[PDB]
Amino acid sequence: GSSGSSGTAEKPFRCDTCDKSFRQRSALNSHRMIHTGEKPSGPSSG
Ligand SMILES: [Zn+2]
């Protein structure tokens, strides 16, 4: 598994793709878009 997680992101927003976090909703809602393009190992919206 090689899992490495703990607690939660001090911030309310978090990217369930690269394990990121933002302070402003407009900052994350946009960052998630960058992931909605390439063909990474893990398809979504299906
Ligand atoms: Zn991300």
Q: Which two tokens stand for residue 6?
A: 């703990």
Surrounding residues of ion ligand 1, Cβ less than 5 A:
15, 17-18, 20
Residue 14 alpha carbon to ligand 1 centre in Å: 8
Smallest Cα–Cα separation from 15: which of 2, 3, 27? 27
Per-domain residue ranges of the chain? 1-46
Q: Are 11 and 2 in contact (CB under 8 A)?
A: no
Residue 18 alpha carbon to ligand 1 centre in Å: 4
Smallest Cα–Cα separation from 44: which of 16, 22, 9? 16
Distance, CA of 40 to CA of 34 (rounded, Å)? 11
Distance, CA of 24 to CA of 31 (rounded, Å)? 11
SS3 category, 36: coil
Strand partners, 33: none
1-46: in CATH 3.40.50.300: no
Residue 19 alpha carbon to ligand 1 centre in Å: 6
Range list of β-strands (E), 1-46? 13-15, 20-22
Q: Are 6 and 21 in contact (CB under 8 A)?
A: no
Distance, CA of 29 to CA of 15 (rounded, Å)? 9
Residue 10 alpha carbon to ligand 1 centre in Å: 16
Contacts for 39-46: CB closer than 8 Å, 24+ residues apart: 42/17
